[PDB]
Design a binder for this molecule. Sequence first.
Ligand SMILES: C=C(C)[C@H]1CN[C@H](C(=O)O)[C@H]1CC(=O)O
Lengths: 50, 51
Amino acid sequence: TLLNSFWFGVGALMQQGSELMPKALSTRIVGGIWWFFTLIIISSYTANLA
Amino acid sequence: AFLTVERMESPIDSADDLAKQTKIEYGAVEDGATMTFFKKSKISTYDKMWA
Ligand SMILES: C=C(C)[C@H]1CN[C@H](C(=O)O)[C@H]1CC(=O)O
C-alpha cells in the first residue's frame, strides 16, 4: 500500500529491516538501490560525526 | 579519513622553508629595497637566501 511503501523507505533508512521484503525483481531493484543509498548516507554521517 | 583529514598545504610556510627547500625557486626585484635587504643582512637565513 502507500502506507507500507513509506514504511519500507523509513525502515530501510534506519537500518532496521521491515516485514515486507520485496519480491518481483522490478521492486527488488528499487529496494536494492535504496539499500545502497542509505548505506552511504549513514556511513558518511557516522564518519563525519566525530 | 577521506572527508576530514587535512588540507594540502603549501610546501613552504616561512622564510626558513625557502632556506632549505631548493626545489622552490626564490625571487626578488633588481634595484629594490628587498634585494638590498638580503644583500646587507647576515642573520642566519637572509644571507643564505642571498647566497
Ligand atoms: C618596484 C620596485 C623595484 C620598488 C617599489 N618600492 C620598493 C622600493 O622603492 O624600494 C621596491 C620593491 C622591492 O624592493 O621589492
